[PDB]
Amino acid sequence: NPPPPETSNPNKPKRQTNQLQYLLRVVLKTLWKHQFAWPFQQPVDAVKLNLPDYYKIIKTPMDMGTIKKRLENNYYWNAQECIQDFNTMFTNCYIYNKPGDDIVLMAEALEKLFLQKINELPT
Ligand SMILES: FC(F)(F)c1nnc2ccc(NCCc3c[nH]c4ccccc34)nn12
Numbered sequence: 001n002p003p004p005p006e007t008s009n010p011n012k013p014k015r016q017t018n019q020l021q022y023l024l025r026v027v028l029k030t031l032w033k034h035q036f037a038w039p040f041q042q043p044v045d046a047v048k049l050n051l052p053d054y055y056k057i058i059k060t061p062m063d064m065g066t067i068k069k070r071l072e073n074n075y076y077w078n079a080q081e082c083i084q085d086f087n088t089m090f091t092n093c094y095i096y097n098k099p100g101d102d103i104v105l106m107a108e109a110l111e112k113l114f115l116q117k118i119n120e121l122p123t
């Protein structure tokens with residue numbers, strides 16, 4: 001396993017915005033409770049899950065546990081940065097797997113719910 005993505009970086013400029021607060025309170029916390037959220041709540045453990053090629057393929061890993069901790073730690077500058085992390089998470093699942101795989105069906109459902117929630121954001 002490589003080290004997981006950082007959740008703190010003292011030199012990085014940070015900001016609290018209404019949209020980032022909404023991404024944590026509403027978007028993250030709703031997706032987190034979905035029946036399909038569990039594979040995505042922590043970094044992929046390639047040793048535990050016996051996926052020795054996972055990080056041979058996936059070079060920008062991302063997961064909702066990392067996103068949650070970034071949001072709680074005030075890591076982001078803006079909502080778009082956080083949205084990009086969600087998109088990286090979904091894309092990684094699609095890249096490492098194949099259409100029709102159970103885990104891909106899970107990511108597809110979560111991505112549709114994610115887009116539904118970010119379609120309208122607070123001002
Ligand atoms: F680690 C991640 F994020 F779960 C993840 N991303 N791509 C993948 C590809 C395979 C995988 N095997 C872990 C156990 C498992 C076997 N069949 C499943 C069907 C749905 C969910 C988990 C599984 N886990 N995996």
Ligand SMILES: [Cl-]
Pocket residue numbers: 014015016017
């Ligand atoms: Cl601020």
